[PDB]
Amino acid sequence: HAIFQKVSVNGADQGSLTGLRAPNNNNPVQNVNSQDMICGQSGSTSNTIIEVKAGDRIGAWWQHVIGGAQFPNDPDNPIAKSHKGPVMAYLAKVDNAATASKTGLKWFKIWEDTFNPSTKTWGVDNLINNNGWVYFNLPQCIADGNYLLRVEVLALHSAYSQGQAQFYQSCAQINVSGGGSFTPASTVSFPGAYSASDPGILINIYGATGQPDNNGQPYTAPGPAPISC
Ligand SMILES: [Cu+2]
């Protein structure tokens, strides 16, 4: 239960919900065929388009509710520690990030923080450790113009049952300058890129003692592999 609700650009705070298509509630999406999978449930919208350079260091801030912790000493802020799982980021080229319809876009993955088996650290663990922030660089080679930046948390604490993995997503509206001439060799659809039977979605992450360490085994995030320039 958390909402991607803020972007930073090379450390510069862009402001709460600025440039975002974000849900107004922290409930998860569990049907991977739903249109809610694209940018989360329909909620707040922004007319701002965040100016970025190719290669910039992007921060995506997650918190329990809109504005931060739900109450003093909220143990589930930025997100509950039980919610082990990967964090992923996608891009989709659009003409106008402010007015583009979210449906039918062509997505490619640019970054993910999944699971380190030897340290037993999930991407959500790093999210919690960074006070709700996840950090990644935009590719240096992507072309100039508007994009939708989709950042996603996949919580697997109940994912041992079909259709009970929990997805939390928002979209950031950005414009890229100083880019290159990269075009993805292939793209995926949302909904469509994920199946409920994917080994990273229908999965028992619990080991012998009941700890969510995936029994020390490597984890396969759903969707395509991140592009590289
Ligand atoms: Cu939750």
Side-chain angles (χ1 to χ4, degrees):
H1 291 67
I3 303 173
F4 167 28
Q5 55 186 267
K6 185 190 278 182
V7 175
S8 67
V9 181
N10 297 334
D13 189 342
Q14 298 305 295
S16 183
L17 293 179
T18 298
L20 295 198
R21 310 182 181 196
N24 47 37
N25 68 79
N26 57 14
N27 292 324
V29 174
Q30 295 181 169
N31 194 322
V32 302
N33 291 337
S34 172
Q35 304 291 311
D36 296 340
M37 290 284 298
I38 305 170
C39 298
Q41 305 166 66
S42 183
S44 68
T45 53
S46 181
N47 284 318
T48 305
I49 300 172
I50 301 167
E51 294 290 335
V52 295
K53 295 282 185 174
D56 274 356
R57 183 71 164 179
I58 304 306
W61 198 39
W62 303 75
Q63 292 285 274
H64 189 191
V65 298
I66 294 296
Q70 190 176 343
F71 52 88
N73 304 316
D74 187 355
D76 299 337
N77 189 63
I79 194 171
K81 305 180 192 317
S82 65
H83 291 33
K84 311 307 190 191
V87 188
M88 297 166 282
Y90 295 78
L91 286 176
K93 184 76 189 65
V94 296
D95 176 70
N96 189 331
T99 61
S101 170
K102 66 184 183 186
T103 69
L105 302 183
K106 295 176 177 298
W107 301 89
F108 57 100
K109 183 183 291 172
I110 66 174
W111 175 88
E112 61 184 9
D113 182 0
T114 60
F115 178 67
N116 188 317
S118 66
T119 70
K120 297 172 180 171
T121 303
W122 296 89
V124 166
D125 288 317
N126 292 323
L127 185 157
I128 296 171
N129 292 327
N130 291 124
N131 302 126
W133 292 95
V134 303
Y135 296 105
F136 52 87
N137 290 93
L138 289 179
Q140 186 72 45
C141 55
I142 55 170
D144 296 339
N146 276 205
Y147 291 85
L148 289 194
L149 173 59
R150 173 188 187 272
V151 188
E152 176 175 40
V153 166
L154 167 53
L156 302 169
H157 49 289
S158 296
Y160 49 89
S161 307
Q162 55 197 340
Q164 295 303 127
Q166 298 184 5
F167 294 88
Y168 304 92
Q169 310 115 340
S170 304
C171 287
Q173 305 163 169
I174 67 172
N175 180 65
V176 171
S177 298
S181 62
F182 173 79
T183 48
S186 66
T187 51
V188 298
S189 309
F190 278 110
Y194 302 165
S195 298
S197 64
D198 287 342
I201 297 178
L202 176 58
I203 175 176
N204 184 358
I205 66 174
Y206 294 96
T209 332
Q211 72 290 18
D213 63 4
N214 209 38
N215 212 226
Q217 296 299 305
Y219 170 83
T220 304
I227 67 103
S228 63
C229 292

